[PDB]
Design a protein around this ligand. Structure first.
Ligand SMILES: O=P(O)(O)OC[C@@H](O)[C@@H](O)[C@H](O)[C@H](O)COP(=O)(O)O
Ligand SMILES: [Ca+2]
Ligand SMILES: [Ca+2]
Ligand SMILES: [Ca+2]
Ligand SMILES: [Ca+2]
Lengths: 326, 324
């Protein structure tokens, strides 16, 4: 897969530093209330969620290549980001119907790729839940949906970042040993599908192809995999796309994520960055409520910075430039 | 633009800049017509067959045919060599329990897939009340932006059909709706002529209910001929895009007389996408007498309908190759 228009390339560059994506993300649009819900008794507010987002944006984007935000609540935050940091806006509705197994994708009702571009984004991000082994008609609908979005992004000449989260229709918990044994299959086969030209993806945002918590040396409990087997999953992942791809952090600590990046590189993965945030800013939330907005600012300038700086130093030794895939 | 490929497709759908197209993407509407002439529920085979019969028999006389991907792909493959293809992209009908009538693409289709199925155009039907809920219309506008963008990327003409309604008026055949129809139609056209929606051709209602116009009415008269004519001129002043009329199932003769009246009034419309005014009578014949009787109906009454329409189009429609 080898194409970038002049504008898509300029946008990718705005999202990167020396071909590496070190992008700052937020978690959901409801998750933040709960981290706040620890105290007071209020749910406060639309006014305040937009604020902490603006504090995290303003203080930490100077050290990130870009920031990913939600349009429904993140636009104020997007306007206070560093001038040297690019912007991705999410296009999907969050969550899924737990009562069914289909997890069908659905774009935000009053958004379009055109509107995302008009709001100043350098990329459209869309999250798809995909079970390669799932219902074939469900997956046809999902493929059709991504084709439309890839087409929109082609027309608006804006990079398409497709996030894939894998699951199994018949496995309740994706942290389970049961899901771990098939994760490589789910992750890598999904990448093969959505690497096809017809879906118009510019960058894949994906899980590491193994639950490192069950790998020898990284596991606290039961061991399902040797380091050699885990490494093979990373090489298989590298072989599953020619597109740039970046890793999301899921279910692991900042330290284990960083150890995973080192292990990915060692194994032969040519990942081109990461898109994580929660670990980087999560601590600012309590401080925000125990000492106020100015103190959260202080947290971000010191602890927040230390977090993202640590990560960047790791990225500097492990990530590969996406320019090498062009 | 038109881009090279969009222009080539528009040419395949047209003759000398005029779209003389046959519409048969009916699904829910076709079901209700067949439901009048039998107690049994219409099957898949009967819907596919009637569509193929109309396609095979009448597309020699049309510049193109509009079919639906659900039942119409076999019909699409037996169309005349000289006729282009449009495929419908929207799910049929709307929710009668609410007033929003929100649009929804067919679940396993995309503009890319429509192009791959051999269409020279994507057709999408939007129900629109210009005076309706502001948030509903915002959602509608965003949806059309997405389709227009898909069609730009796949480099395939976007035909947007607009059917108007009023959230608080149950029956769009009523005098009450007639009195506001010109507003509904012409202001909707003006919105969806905005560049951001990527429309190449508007498929629209005539901006008057001609059954209430002086000289055409058989009962109550709501409008003089001069008032009706002015509604056509306002329609022409609402867009510089190519636009074509749908027949809305009036008689072949009223539709024909309406086109004459439109041209006389100053409407520079670029053709039609006409279905029921042409083949409506074939449904009962197919159900009650079977496919052979339907062919013969199509070869006589159907031909007669479409032939008389084409003659009227020849002396009323304006070429879109002026609007480019
Ligand atoms: O509700 P359904 O089953 O989806 O049918 C609607 C569809 O047929 C219309 O959009 C016609 O294409 C259009 O009005 C031109 O057809 P005529 O009005 O000229 O017959
Ligand atoms: Ca930069
Ligand atoms: Ca314009
Ligand atoms: Ca005009
Ligand atoms: Ca003439």
């Amino acid at each position: 897969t080898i194409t970038l228009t002049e504008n898509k390339r300029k946008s990718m560059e705005k999202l990167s530093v020396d071909g590496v994506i070190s992008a700052l993300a937020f978690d959901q649009r409801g998750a933040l209330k709960r981290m706040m819900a620890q105290h007071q008794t209020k749910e406060p507010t639309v006014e305040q969620i937009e604020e902490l987002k603006s504090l995290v944006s303003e203080e930490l984007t100077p050290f990130a290549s870009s920031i990913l935000l939600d349009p429904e609540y993140g636009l104020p935050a997007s306007r206070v980001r560093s001038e040297e940091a690019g912007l991705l806006l999410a296009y999907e509705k969050t969550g899924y119907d737990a009562t069914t197994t289909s997890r069908l994708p659905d774009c935000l009702d009053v958004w379009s790729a055109k509107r995302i571009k008009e709001a100043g984004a350098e990329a459209v991000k869309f999250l798809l839940y995909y079970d390669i082994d799932g219902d074939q008609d469900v997956n046809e609908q999902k493929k059709a949906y991504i084709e439309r979005i890839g087409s929109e992004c082609r027309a608006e000449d804006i990079p398409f970042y497709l996030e894939i989260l894998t699951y199994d229709e018949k496995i309740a918990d994706n942290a389970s040993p049961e899901f771990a044994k098939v994760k490589a299959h789910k992750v890598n086969e999904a990448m093969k599908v959505f690497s096809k030209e017809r879906f118009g993806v510019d960058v894949l945002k994906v899980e590491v192809p193994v639950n490192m918590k069950f790998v020898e040396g990284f596991a606290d409990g039961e061991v399902l995999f040797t380091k050699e087997e885990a490494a093979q999953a990373f090489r298989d992942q590298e072989a599953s796309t020619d597109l740039p791809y970046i890793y999301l952090s899921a279910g692991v600590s900042a330290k284990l994520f960083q150890d995973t990046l080192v292990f990915a590189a060692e194994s032969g993965a040519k990942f081109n960055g990461v898109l994580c945030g929660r670990a980087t800013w999560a601590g600012s939330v309590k401080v925000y409520i125990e000492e106020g907005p100015q103190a959260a600012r202080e947290w971000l300038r010191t602890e927040g910075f230390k977090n993202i700086d640590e990560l960047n130093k790791v990225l500097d030794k492990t990530a590969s430039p996406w320019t090498e895939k062009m």
